[PDB]
Amino acid sequence: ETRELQSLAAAVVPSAQTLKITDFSFSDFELSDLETALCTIRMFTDLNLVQNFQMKHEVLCRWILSVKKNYRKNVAYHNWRHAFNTAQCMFAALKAGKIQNKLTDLEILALLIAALSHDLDHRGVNNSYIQRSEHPLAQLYCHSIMEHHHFDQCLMILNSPGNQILSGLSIEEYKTTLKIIKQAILATDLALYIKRRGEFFELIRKNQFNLEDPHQKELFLAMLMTACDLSAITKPWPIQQRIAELVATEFWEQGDLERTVLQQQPIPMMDRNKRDELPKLQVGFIDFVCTQLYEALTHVSEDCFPLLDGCRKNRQKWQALAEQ
Numbered sequence: 001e002t003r004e005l006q007s008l009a010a011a012v013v014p015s016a017q018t019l020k021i022t023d024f025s026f027s028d029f030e031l032s033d034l035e036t037a038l039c040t041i042r043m044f045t046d047l048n049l050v051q052n053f054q055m056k057h058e059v060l061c062r063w064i065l066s067v068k069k070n071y072r073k074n075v076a077y078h079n080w081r082h083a084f085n086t087a088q089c090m091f092a093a094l095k096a097g098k099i100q101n102k103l104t105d106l107e108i109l110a111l112l113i114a115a116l117s118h119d120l121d122h123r124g125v126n127n128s129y130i131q132r133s134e135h136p137l138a139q140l141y142c143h144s145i146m147e148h149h150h151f152d153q154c155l156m157i158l159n160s161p162g163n164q165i166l167s168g169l170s171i172e173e174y175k176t177t178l179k180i181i182k183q184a185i186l187a188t189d190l191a192l193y194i195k196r197r198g199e200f201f202e203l204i205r206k207n208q209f210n211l212e213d214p215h216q217k218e219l220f221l222a223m224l225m226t227a228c229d230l231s232a233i234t235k236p237w238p239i240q241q242r243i244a245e246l247v248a249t250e251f252w253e254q255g256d257l258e259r260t261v262l263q264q265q266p267i268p269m270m271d272r273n274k275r276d277e278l279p280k281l282q283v284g285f286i287d288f289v290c291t292q293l294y295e296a297l298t299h300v301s302e303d304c305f306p307l308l309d310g311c312r313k314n315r316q317k318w319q320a321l322a323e324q
């Protein structure tokens, strides 16, 4: 622990190119926990966030390890690896996808922090499950229960001694940054994505999209977050297939809880008896949620196409299995 920290602060950080983190095709699967922390340091560095905000090396390392530790290893999918991947998709969206110079430094700082923080202390279970099972977290919060908890955890970490990576900021810049972080985290609630999609899609469709407008900037950021959150849907096939079983593992565990705690029939997505239905379900997922989103991000930035390409290729593959 104090040893993992001394390991990390002493290590050489390889370049962005050596670590492959500018590729939309990036895979974490064969990296050690230590190597993922190294990648993260690089991400903060090449977005000019260490330089622009006076982050001490030792402090960023301690924060990165604090985050990593507050994810739950026993949770099939919503653990550190997902948080890390989400951040890597953000980093590629900013660098390879060229979103970077459409945003301010404060926004980028917020997004990257948010990407790594957005699922902190997840329990492998829904908002619905949390609500209906009367879990304590649903007395503190009445909408986006999990997402509000994730932000609270994030805030709690940014403010614990030795971990204050935002300390270089003025009271004004700090308040601004937290506000963006909160909105970014809240935006990773699929319900709120569905709720605001249509406005974003009409803006694109009528060629009225414009980042100069404060309201549209906010919207775009929310969309970006969803794009990164769902990004495993865009990876090469060996990766996507592997990641899908993890997500399914996580759902099936929830279905168990729903059968015993709530006494209801879990929905196919969530029933292990219909393990057979996974392909068809993934196709449905892609069609209803993902493709339209990556189609739009590609209108915002030509260079984000590889995300939509990846998504369409995974659709073909799942559809092939859906007919056996």
Ligand SMILES: CCCc1nn(C)c2c(=O)[nH]c(-c3cc(S(=O)(=O)N4CCN(C)CC4)ccc3OCC)nc12
Binding pocket: 190, 229, 230, 232, 233, 244, 247, 248, 269, 278, 281, 282, 284, 285, 286, 288, 289
């Ligand atoms: C909170 C988890 C979001 C998510 N991440 N990832 C990687 C996936 C995924 O691969 N599949 C699904 C998924 C979504 C639907 S859904 O789009 O049909 N579902 C319908 C109802 N809405 C409200 C939510 C999504 C159905 C099946 C799924 O996976 C089974 C392996 N969700 C996620």
Ligand SMILES: [Mg+2]
Binding pocket: 118, 119, 188, 189
């Ligand atoms: Mg989430």
Ligand SMILES: [Zn+2]
Binding pocket: 082, 086, 118, 119, 188, 229
């Ligand atoms: Zn997530």
